[PDB]
A paper describes a structure:
Vaccines and therapeutics targeting the critical viral spike glycoprotein (S) must accommodate the mutations in S. Even the highly conserved region that plays a critical role in membrane fusion exhibits up to three mutations in the HR1 region of Omicron variants. To reduce the public health threat of Omicron and future emerging variants, we and others have proposed development of antivirals targeting the relatively conserved heptad repeat 1 and 2 (HR1 and HR2) regions of the spike glycoprotein (S) that drive membrane fusion by the formation of the HR1HR2 postfusion bundle. Although the ~130 residues of the HR1 and HR2 regions are conserved in all prior SARS-CoV-2 variants, a few mutations have reached fixation with Omicron in the HR1 region (Q954H and N969K for all Omicron subvariants, and, additionally, L981F for BA.1).
Previously, we reported an unmodified peptide with an extended sequence composed of 42 amino acids of the HR2 region, termed longHR2_42, that was designed to target these relatively more conserved HR1HR2 regions; this efficacious peptide inhibits infections by the original Wuhan strain and several variants of SARS-CoV-2 with an IC50 of ~1 nM. However, the inhibition activity of this peptide against the Omicron variant was around fourfold weaker in the vesicular stomatitis virus (VSV)-SARS-CoV-2 chimera infection assay and around tenfold weaker in the authentic SARS-CoV-2 infection assay. We hypothesized that this decreased inhibition activity is probably caused by the three mutations in the HR1 region—Q954H, N969K, and L981F—of Omicron BA. New mutations emerged both at antigenic interfaces under heavy selection pressure, such as the RBD, and at more distant but functionally critical sites, such as the S protein fusion core comprised of the HR1 and HR2 regions. These mutations within the fusion core of Omicron lead to major conformational changes of HR2 in the structure of the HR1HR2 postfusion bundle and a decreased activity of a potent HR2-based inhibitor against infection. The N969K mutant structure revealed a similar HR2 backbone displacement as observed in the Omicron HR1HR2 structure with all three mutations —the average Cα atom rmsd for residues 1,162 to 1,170 is 0.7 Å between the N969K structure and the Omicron structure, 2.3 Å between the N969K structure and the Wuhan structure, and 2.4 Å between the Omicron variant structure and the Wuhan strain structure. The comparison with the Omicron and Wuhan postfusion bundle structures illustrates structural rearrangement of HR2 to accommodate the long lysine sidechain at position 969. However, the L981F mutation is probably not required for tolerating the destabilization of the postfusion S by the N969K mutation, since several Omicron subvariants do not have the L981F mutation.
Residue numbers in the entry:
A (entry chain D), B (entry chain F), C (entry chain E): 1159 to 1200
D (entry chain C), E (entry chain A), F (entry chain B): 918 to 988
The structure:
Amino acid sequence: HTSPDVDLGDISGINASVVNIQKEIDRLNEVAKNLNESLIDL
Amino acid sequence: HTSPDVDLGDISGINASVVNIQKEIDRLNEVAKNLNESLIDL
Amino acid sequence: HTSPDVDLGDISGINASVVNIQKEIDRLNEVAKNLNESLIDL
Amino acid sequence: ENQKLIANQFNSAIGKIQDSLSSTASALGKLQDVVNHNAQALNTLVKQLSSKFGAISSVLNDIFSRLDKVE
Amino acid sequence: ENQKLIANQFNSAIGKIQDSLSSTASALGKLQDVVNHNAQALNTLVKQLSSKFGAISSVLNDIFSRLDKVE
Amino acid sequence: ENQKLIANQFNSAIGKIQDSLSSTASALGKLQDVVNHNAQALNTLVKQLSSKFGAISSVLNDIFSRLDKVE
């Protein structure tokens, strides 16, 4: 008798990363706005 | 006696988004094809 | 009596893809380095 | 002669930027495909998970009922 | 006259590359948003999964205990 | 003098597009890394999930067997 406490264990050892490329996106938008200063006006 | 109906409950409140950037990809390909009209022919 | 072996079944039929765009990233970095040969030196 | 140099450098730059835009389009296409596939994967995972958890709950409720009938 | 041609072609190319950079920024923003949302989704999935699996384990341990008390 | 203006504007534009391509490469690299890591995460999640669900099923089959032996 006395059945042991069969513990299923905790699901673990896993996790999802998190992208943080907002610096890069902001830099692209800044460059797209800045290229207006590179237009040629003869 | 009369053990209650222990309901585990439904896994919910979660969901995965869906990217739809095909407009942007098509615009990039259109621009890559259109830059041929920007080549300089002296 | 003789309760049947109720098998839960295996979770399956699913799988996550794997991106392999390292060729494209390397091509972008190569172009960003190559545009230095496109600078104009009058 | 300087105009021919400017024109040649500009055409080379536009060709290189054309290649870069094609590469960016291909990369965004592959990321779109894979993120969408993994989204569908997680969604169907939670669907089949809900089903399996409900089935487990049912067979439990069953064995409590039957063990209560034992007592 | 050739300078006006060079200038016009250059301005057209810069406008097109401006559009391409805006499109790339928008696409990377949408991918960032969705990948982050799916990351949070998988994380909370495993959290609620750990909770549910623990609850299942508990009610099991319970029914072994009670069935042992039956015998 | 107009040629020097054209050359200066072109070099500035190429420098800015160089920065933009470096930024796009970095962003695609980070998205690739994270999407791949989350893909491996979901895959190992379903693997360990299959294992845990099978173990649950086994211990069930066990307790039906033992409760049948009770009756």
